[PDB]
Amino acid sequence: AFDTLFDHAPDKLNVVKKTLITFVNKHLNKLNLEVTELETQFADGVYLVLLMGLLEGYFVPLHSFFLTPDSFEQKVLNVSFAFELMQDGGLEKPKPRPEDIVNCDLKSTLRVLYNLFTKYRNVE
Amino acid sequence: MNKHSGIDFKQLNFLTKLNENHSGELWKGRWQGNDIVVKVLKVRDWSTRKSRDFNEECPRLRIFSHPNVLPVLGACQSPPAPHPTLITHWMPYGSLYNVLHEGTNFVVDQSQAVKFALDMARGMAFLHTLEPLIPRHALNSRSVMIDEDMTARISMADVKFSFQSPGRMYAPAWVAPEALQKKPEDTNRQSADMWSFAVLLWELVTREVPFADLSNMEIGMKVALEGLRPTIPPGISPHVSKLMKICMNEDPAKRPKFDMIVPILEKMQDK
Numbered sequence: 200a201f202d203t204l205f206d207h208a209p210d211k212l213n214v215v216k217k218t219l220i221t222f223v224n225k226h227l228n229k230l231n232l233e234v235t236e237l238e239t240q241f242a243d244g245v246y247l248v249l250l251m252g253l254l255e256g257y258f259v260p261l262h263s264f265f266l267t268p269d270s271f272e273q274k275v276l277n278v279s280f281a282f283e284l285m286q287d288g289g290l291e292k293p294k295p296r297p298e299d300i301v302n303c304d305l306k307s308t309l310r311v312l313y314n315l316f317t318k319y320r321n322v323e
Numbered sequence: 324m325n326k327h328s329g330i331d332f333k334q335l336n337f338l339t340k341l342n343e344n345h346s347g348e349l350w351k352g353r354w355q356g357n358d359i360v361v362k363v364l365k366v367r368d369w370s371t372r373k374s375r376d377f378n379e380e381c382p383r384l385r386i387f388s389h390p391n392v393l394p395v396l397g398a399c400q401s402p403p404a405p406h407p408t409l410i411t412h413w414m415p416y417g418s419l420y421n422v423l424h425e426g427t428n429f430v431v432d433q434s435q436a437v438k439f440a441l442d443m444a445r446g447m448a449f450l451h452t453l454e455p456l457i458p459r460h461a462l463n464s465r466s467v468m469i470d471e472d473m474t475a476r477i478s479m480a481d482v483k484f485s486f487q488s489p490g491r492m493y494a495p496a497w498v499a500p501e502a503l504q505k506k507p508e509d510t511n512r513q514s515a516d517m518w519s520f521a522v523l524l525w526e527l528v529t530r531e532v533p534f535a536d537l538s539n540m541e542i543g544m545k546v547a548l549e550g551l552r553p554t555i556p557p558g559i560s561p562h563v564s565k566l567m568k569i570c571m572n573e574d575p576a577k578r579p580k581f582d583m584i585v586p587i588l589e590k591m592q593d594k
């Protein structure tokens with residue numbers, strides 16, 4: 200599914216990336232936050248956590264994650280927590296390890312975002 | 324040889340489903356001659372540990388000794404029940420939120436609103452005499468119920484159990500700024516509850532949902548980090564303004580206890 204969207208259509212990868220950029224900004228702009236680069240801006244887990252609350256209708260208490268992570272380990276914990284929120288909302292366990300997102304593996308990042316897009320396209 | 328067996332799930336008569344959401348399903352039903360509401364809880368990764376915890380936490384909610392507290396009548400232990408389940412009496416008017424914001428038949432007058440405030444203050448004062456405090460009750464207009472004689476009652480069925488995700492807050496507009504940011508162990512619970520009460524006063528004064536134009540995530544982040552506060556309404560009495568301001572003090576330590584605002588609200592009664 201995500202093998203063809205990634206590998207053998209390089210200009211179509213850019214189509215999905217522009218679509219995902221648009222979708223995450225629909226929501227994160229409400230917190231005065233802007234995403235211009237999917238390669239790095241979700242790696243520390245913060246925007247994934249904030250995005251899940253925007254998409255599923257809750258606030259995440261700031262003691263539940265690291266709003267300003269100061270280590271690789273805290274970024275992994277943020278991403279792992281965001282994955283838990285993902286499963287809370289009905290998505291199946293995400294395929295990538297938490298570390299894959301923190302290490303800016305674009306395929307791991309793009310898969311997680313695309314699954315959020317597939318589910319929440321129409322949330323306003 | 325358990326101290327409680329709980330309510331037998333097989334004795335519940337499920338009549339009509341009222342709601343379903345992330346937390347479970349609500350049904351109107353009947354049990355042992357009572358008109359009841361049943362909440363069937365939705366829990367991911369249910370376990371024997373969580374089930375043990377549910378069964379230790381539910382008995383604390385069976386509070387029959389105060390008119391402004393609505394007890395859990397009982398709970399169905401799972402196993403043997405299919406899911407962990409709570410039962411309470413059916414409150415004909417529904418929640419305070421329903422009565423204030425979804426009331427299609429009548430608008431409660433301000434004498435009734437002041438009585439609601441007194442009712443809630445008395446129930447919360449009583450709850451704060453209990454040792455230890457009932458873990459994780461968030462005071463807001465959805466967690467106060469209006470009984471057949473219009474008495475407002477704190478809903479013990481709306482507590483959050485230990486296994487219900489602490490990382491997802493669904494009514495942040497009523498939560499004190501410090502409680503949006505700090506673990507409950509690092510906050511004074513009665514001061515945090517008094518902030519919630521102040522927002523209830525605001526809601527009773529304006530007949531508006533606080534921050535209705537914002538998503539829950541926007542509310543929590545702006546209240547915690549950008550100083551967003553309810554706008555004190557124009558043209559209310561100085562006495563109501565003063566009470567709202569002291570209950571919503573930025574310093575938790577300067578907020579009054581519930582038992583100190585009960586006599587204030589008593590003198591405000593007109594009925």
Ligand SMILES: COc1cc2ncnc(Nc3ccc(F)c(Cl)c3)c2cc1OCCCN1CCOCC1
Nearest residue numbers: 341360361362409410411412413414415416417480
């Ligand atoms: C008169 O209606 C209610 C009485 C209630 N009385 C007592 N408790 C309620 N809720 C409740 C909340 C949590 C619980 F664990 C349990 Cl056991 C019960 C009640 C919820 C009630 O309504 C729930 C759904 C009301 N909405 C209002 C409009 O939209 C659809 C239905």
